[PDB]
Symmetry: C3
Subunit: 411 residues, 3 copies
């Protein structure tokens, strides 16, 4: 093989290179040829990711839950925790607002096979609620059907914690192992993501290659018009959420960012919120942060509190929805906010991360990728993920420090 380059550029090459190879084929040799020999690889890629969606949505939440089991965290955390949720809860709320002013997709409308998309009527409100509670975890889990799963995972995780406080040692010990195994399953699923991401370059080249053969050039407008909605959203996040809640705690924002200057750029280029933990802690002290404080929060916000992603999944949803020609009904629209948070708490904080947990938010809100259109749209954002992933990852780290700094203030 030999293929050793820095995946980041190593992927941007497929993106920029795929777009051109796609367009030239815009005219000339009809893309049909592309939809036959090129797209197949773009699909292999798309599936390798949906593969993971279940095992991670599960293992990922049983662990996430246990890392917030009230009570199971000093009240030094209770504070920080309430922090992460509200930051992320708002992060998405903001994303929807960007989706509003910016109508990414709207106009990009596609009917794939010639037929358009239409969702199945939601069962009576009563059943929609009772359905969140799986009737058979194994089953619900066995065959897609997210929510039910999420629900069971949180209940499993939070339950495991209380076993750890069990007077009995066998019990206290069993829980430790089981919880240990789950985790690992999830932690192992990431190795797979990282691995898959090594194929990202080829896959991305196929996806965008295809989206260019078809859809003409109009997609470039929508794709970029999407990115705009994201960043103008990410920077708003920081400016309207961070600085606003930093001057609220007598913290100099300006100088603040000058210290996180290394923690941000690091995460922004590596895209590995997790792999950028050391650089996030070095900066922890540098700005006079108490040891027992960033030693606890920075490592927790590395997986949880990915408000940078929550904004992503918020806008991503409206992109798909608008591209298909469907209008999200407030209710499912507020389901995104509720979901995106758990979906973000699910993200691994690695290259693939974000995108993968998007399916979680799509299956919920009725937009199965098993559908020609949805899968056709999803394949677009998944192609420009890298771009959105960078600015994404950066906010994730920021939110952490910005939380750690504020928690110190009142501790």
């Amino acid at each position: 093989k030999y293929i050793e380059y820095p995946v980041l550029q190593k992927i941007l090459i497929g993106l920029i290179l795929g777009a051109i190879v796609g367009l030239i084929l815009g005219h000339y040799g009809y893309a049909h040829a592309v939809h036959t020999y090129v797209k197949p690889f773009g699909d292999l890629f798309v599936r390798l990711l949906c593969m993971l969606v279940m095992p991670i949505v599960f293992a990922s939440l049983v662990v996430g839950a246990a890392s917030i089991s009230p009570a199971r965290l000093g009240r030094v955390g209770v504070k920080i925790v309430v922090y992460y949720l509200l930051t992320s809860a708002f992060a998405v709320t903001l994303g929807i607002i960007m989706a509003r002013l910016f109508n990414p997709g709207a106009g990009i409308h596609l009917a794939v096979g010639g037929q358009q998309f239409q969702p199945h009527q939601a069962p009576p409100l009563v059943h929609i609620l009772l359905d969140i509670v799986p009737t058979n975890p194994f089953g619900a889990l066995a065959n897609g059907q997210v929510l039910p799963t999420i629900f069971f995972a949180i209940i499993l995780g939070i339950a495991i914690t209380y076993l750890m406080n069990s007077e009995n040692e066998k019990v206290r010990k069993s829980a430790e192992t089981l919880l240990d195994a789950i985790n690992g399953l999830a932690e192992a699923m990431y190795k797979i993501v990282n691995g898959v991401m090594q194929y990202a370059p080829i896959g991305v080249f196929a996806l965008i290659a295809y989206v260019m053969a078809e859809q003409g050039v109009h997609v470039v407008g929508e794709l970029a018009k999407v990115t705009a909605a994201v960043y103008v959203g990410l920077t708003l996040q920081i400016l309207l959420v961070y600085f606003v809640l930093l001057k609220i705690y007598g913290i100099d924002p300006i100088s603040f960012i000058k210290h996180a200057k290394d923690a941000m750029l690091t995460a922004f280029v590596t895209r590995s919120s997790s792999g950028t933990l050391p650089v996030t802690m070095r900066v922890a002290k540098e700005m006079g942060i108490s040891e027992g404080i960033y030693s606890f929060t920075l490592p927790l916000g590395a997986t949880i509190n990915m408000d940078g992603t929550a904004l992503y999944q918020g806008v991503a949803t409206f992109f798909i929805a608008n591209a298909l020609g469907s209008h999200l009904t407030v209710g499912q629209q507020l389901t995104i906010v509720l979901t995106a948070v758990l979906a973000s708490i699910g993200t691994a904080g690695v290259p693939g991360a974000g995108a993968i947990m998007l399916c979680m938010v799509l299956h919920s809100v009725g937009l199965p990728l098993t559908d020609p259109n949805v899968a056709a749209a999803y394949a677009m954002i998944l192609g420009i993920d890298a771009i959105l992933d960078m600015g994404r990852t950066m906010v994730n780290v920021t939110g952490d420090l910005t939380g750690t700094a504020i928690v110190a203030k009142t501790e």
Copy 2:
């Protein structure tokens, strides 16, 4: 929230309070209003429990099996073990007899939606037997289908034990962990039960509230006429099984019970056979019981040997069956005995315990709760569970001591 009362009364309040709120609505505002705003909560409750039914029927038996893996128990146990089964095997056999004289349900007959219940013809005997052996554990397990599951769990558990005797240490160690993880899954599922039971008060209030709006008052007769069948069954258990097998071993029954006086009342009020282990052992010595003897049996009979429940599940089945208008065919009727034992060996020995493992015995014997009628009946017993649960739990503990005392005699 604030809600801190002693669940036991805290639930009896919903029961007694729900019945009245139900009847007043007997006349006046037709219960239809109830079947619309009240029943939904009674259902949330009913599902939270069926949820657990699979993970526990599995983890619960893999562990139960390993705790009886012949050989894997001193022959000091072999004795005690043969004891528990036969006590429980008969406990149910007795329950069926109570179901006989007392026809709980019979006359309570309901057709829910207006249609009546009718079971699917059982496949040729040949297939019924071969079917107990799952063709794909994961599958069989994934989507309901008990028996197959039970079967695989026992085989898994008993198998794990033999790995622990493996000369090789890696093998011997692996088995230890895996077995450790399973357990925990089950031990964790109980935390959930306990949790769910914290909702019991609300749920019960809904269930019985509904059963009173409909069915008029005739249900009170059947419900109580059921309780009778149980207790007059539990006391018979003790009197015809315990005292009979106590005077058979030169053990003074009268005085006997005077010592277990604290172990019984304890379990009878806490309803936590497990949580009542310390009080069961304090009494262990008090009556001159050898250390190495109650140190081994009392802790084993805390989970296994729940002959108090086996009687429950025995009568419970005939209640449902009679309420629907179906006559249990001897064969499925003897299936209950065979099932109820494993179902009791599955019970956790906690508040929820009993009822939850009932579904296990229902899915077997063809009475899926996924059915309007069955689910309608089940919802009745599940409403008066607390009452039956107390006298239940008490016999569970008794059987333990009554076994420990006899095993000492011959050891």
Copy 3:
């Protein structure tokens, strides 16, 4: 029970005894009586094995994969590993050639219920490839569907290894447990096989008993005509593969076998490649083998590198195929080679081993045992497994030593 004999003979008795009881009923009392009271037991047996097929195809490969995770093995192994695959890869390639000259089954053609067998058209090549990648591991696994499973297992296993090299200790530790649990699941599934094999005597008696009542005596020709294809294949394996690659490394083959004389006969009679490890190592030195060399290879080739089985599963497939009247299309025919290897790397190296992993190779290549014909054919080979199993097991061990000896030469 009492039943304590040496399963090996203890089974040959059922085989030889079943055949006679079958034929006498050839004439006289039509076998219909047999297909009603005899076959049912032959089926119980057949299912007990298919039961295991999934849990083992999974746990079995996650472990197998981790035991070859490149890199995760000294380069002292890389050598030995490349060895096992190529030996087994060719072992099967050879089996197909035996299936060619010998047309086991061809002529044995059956239509069970009166209808013949016909496979479902394979989806477009594109989908056949993308389908190997499961969309939902849990699902794919939950309900049969091998390949997808295999694929995920290898990716899980190989992934776990890289977690063990993780700087972080928690990560490094989690992977250890999870990997530990999986293994055990598989190691436990064998206990079940061994157990099931204790029923082998009865089961085999039923199977062949039936195949004799029907099919007349013509089956004896095919059954034996099959065995021939195997052995004349196993001996060719050794002579054309081993001796050829032994004189290639200045190793005296003749004398060679005189030392493995005990390691072979041992494995040949016990049929437990694994249980014959000690006798394989005693011989390790005896022939001047470096400690650090057979201490690493012999224990690895005990589970992996079962080229004796790979030849089995190679011919076994053509037996079934020919018996049904279907011609394996080169492509699925080369799928067998690719599958048989993983299928052999799946075998446990115990009595049942081989046969059980055959289903793995059948589900792949479209020949579900859920089909009257396939299941009818499979039931024949499964009846004479013991015979093929012995000569099988022997080559498995041989390949090990023959690999160890050659790796020492160049190390």
